[PDB]
């Protein structure tokens, strides 16, 4: 069931903003590891004395990396005279976020039809305001409300990246591309799932789509997908959600799932780079898992395609409507907190429906099953 209860018009995920200590080094690492191109900047070279912000893109996926400069560079500014291109930015908030949580996502940004209206309706329906609507160059409106922990849901609306950002020079914009095309879902970890769902669904009208309980909130067309997890305590192996909350100093964004148009190419390219500056992947499932794939998805993937899944460590799950291929990186930074998922979905062709094939929850059983089997 989909009651289509969105309280304002939501379009698609727009960007993800990481708050960093040094944006240059994180952005360069991510560009090489994920095959994303440098496409826009706002920094000292563009007149921004407040923050350094670098935008990477792959298809429709936009990752923004921001870090504060010394406050002394902008000490004479006030908000009416600011050189910041993102008016919600604050030095103290950024340093506090980073000190508390380490490298991670500060903003999940969605494009809406009217960011001032979305903000107004959200706050009228219980959202905690974070940054009020601000109109940039009479062209773009941006507003922020609290999502969970110190993560904000950012609303962006366009009259027709952001004013004050400059498209980057060609030489610095090497056209890397490993096949990633858009953000599929963004997942939060919280101590208590119930209150988190009630809060977010309360202000958005989004509907509902071992070691954890999870539920997914979705927009009307189910293209904005926000799963939320809570830990389950007292378990034999300690909950990975609880480890996250301990190392992150509380709730925050757990993972970003990035859709690829060719997951085999994406994983070939990312794995070639794991040990030369890129991203590592979690341990692969045992060969029993791939033996057991013929019975589960043998009508969807050929033996060769199943073998390619095994060469790359790709997991497969299936629901009533479609099939999903997925794989998980090791944590992106020092702390065992945020990671990335690469995904590709098969089925639900109408365009493809959002969330086709689910989120892989069946792989909890199949991995557990496969590991024991593998002891053999």
Ligand X SMILES: Cc1ccc(C(=O)CN2C(=O)CSc3ccc(C(O)=C4C(=O)CCCC4=O)cc32)cc1
Per CB under 5 A, residues contacting Co ion are: 257, 341, 359
Helices (DSSP H) in 210-359: which residue ranges?
A: 240-248, 263-272, 287-291, 293-297, 303-312
- In angstroms, rounded to a whole number, what is the distance separating the alpha carbons of residues 278 and 283? 16
State the minimum distance, in angstroms, from the CB of residue 359 to ligand X. 4
Contacts of 215 (CB under 8 A, 6+ apart): 193, 197, 208, 227, 228
Give the nearer residue to a second copy in terms of CB position, either 177 or 184: 177
217 belongs to the binding site for ligand X (CB under 6 A)? no
Q: Which is nearer to ligand X, 86 or 180 (CB)?
A: 180
Q: Which stretch binds ligand X (CB under 6 A): 19-27, 39-47, 57-65, 324-332?
A: 324-332
335 in contact with a second copy (CB under 8 A): yes
Residues 52-81 within binding reach of a second copy (CB under 8 A): 52, 67, 69-70, 72-73
56, 177 contact by CB (below 8 A): no
From Co ion, a second copy, ligand X, none, interface partner of 339 (C-beta below 5 to 8 A by class): ligand X
Dihedral sign (CA 29, 33, 38, 42):
negative
Q: Which stretch binds ligand X (CB under 6 A): 2-10, 35-43, 90-98, 326-334?
A: 326-334
130 lies in the binding site for a second copy (CB under 8 A): no
- Rounded-to-integer distance, Cα 82 and Cα 90, Å: 11
Interface with ligand X, residue 214, by CB under 6 A: yes
Binding partner of residue 32 among ligand X, Co ion, a second copy, none, CB cut-off 5 to 8 Å per kind:
a second copy
Residue 224 CB, nearest approach to a second copy (Å): 28
Phi, psi of 166 (to 5 degrees): -115, 140
Q: To which residue do tokens 């997914």 refer?
A: 216
Q: Which is nearer to Co ion, 226 or 297 (by Cβ)?
A: 226
- Least distance in angstroms from the C-beta of 135 to ligand X: 35
The length of the chain, given as a count of residues: 376
Pick one of 10, 16, 20, 180: the residue that binds a second copy (CB under 8 A): 20
Which is it for the CA torsion 177, 179, 185, 188, positive or negative?
A: negative
- Partner in contact with 172, chosen from ligand X, a second copy, Co ion, none, beta carbon below 5 to 8 Å by kind: a second copy
According to DSSP, residue 239 is labeled P
341 is in an annotated binding site: yes
Kindly tell me which residue out of 245, 341, 356, 357 binds ligand X, with binding defined by CB under 6 A. Answer: 341
Q: How many whole angstroms separate alpha carbon 178 and alpha carbon 269?
A: 6
């Amino acid at each position: 069931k989909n009651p289509k209860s969105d309280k304002f018009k939501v379009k698609r995920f727009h960007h993800i903003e990481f708050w960093c200590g040094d944006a240059t080094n994180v952005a360069r690492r991510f560009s090489w590891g994920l095959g994303m191109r440098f496409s826009a900047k706002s920094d000292l070279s563009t007149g921004n004395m407040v923050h350094a912000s670098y935008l990477l893109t792959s298809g429709d996926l936009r990752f923004l990396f921001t870090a504060p400069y010394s406050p002394s560079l902008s000490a004479g500014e006030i908000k009416p005279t600011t050189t910041a291109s993102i008016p919600s930015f604050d030095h103290g908030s950024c340093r506090s976020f980073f000190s508390s949580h380490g490298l991670g996502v500060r903003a999940v940004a969605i494009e809406v039809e009217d960011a001032e209206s979305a903000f107004s309706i959200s706050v009228a329906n219980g959202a905690i305001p974070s940054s009020p609507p601000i109109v940039l160059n009479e062209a773009v409106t941006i507003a922020e409300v609290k999502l969970y922990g110190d993560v904000v849901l950012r609303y962006v609306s366009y009259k027709a990246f952001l004013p004050g950002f400059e498209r980057v020079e060609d030489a610095s914009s090497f056209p890397l591309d490993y096949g990633i095309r858009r953000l599929d879902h963004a997942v939060g970890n919280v101590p208590e799932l119930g209150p988190a769902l009630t809060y977010v669904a309360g202000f958005t009208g989004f509907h509902q789509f071992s070691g954890l309980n999870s539920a997914v909130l979705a927009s009307n067309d189910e293209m904005v997908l926000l799963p939320i997890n809570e830990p389950v305590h007292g378990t034999k192996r300690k909950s990975q959600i609880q480890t996250y909350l301990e190392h992150n100093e509380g709730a925050g964004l757990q993972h970003l799932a990035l859709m690829s148009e060719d997951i085999f190419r994406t994983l070939r390219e990312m794995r070639k780079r794991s040990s030369i500056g890129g991203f590592d992947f979690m341990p692969s499932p045992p060969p029993t898992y791939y033996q057991n794939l013929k019975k589960r998805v043998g009508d969807v993937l050929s033996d060769d395609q199943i073998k390619e899944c095994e060469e790359l460590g790709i997991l497969v799950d299936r629901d009533d409507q479609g099939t999903l291929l997925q794989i998980f990186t090791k944590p992106l930074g020092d702390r065992p907190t945020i990671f990335i998922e690469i995904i590709q979905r098969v089925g639900c062709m109408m365009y493809q429906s959002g969330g086709c094939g689910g989120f892989g929850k069946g792989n909890f059983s199949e991995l557990f099953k496969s590991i024991e089997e593998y002891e053999k």
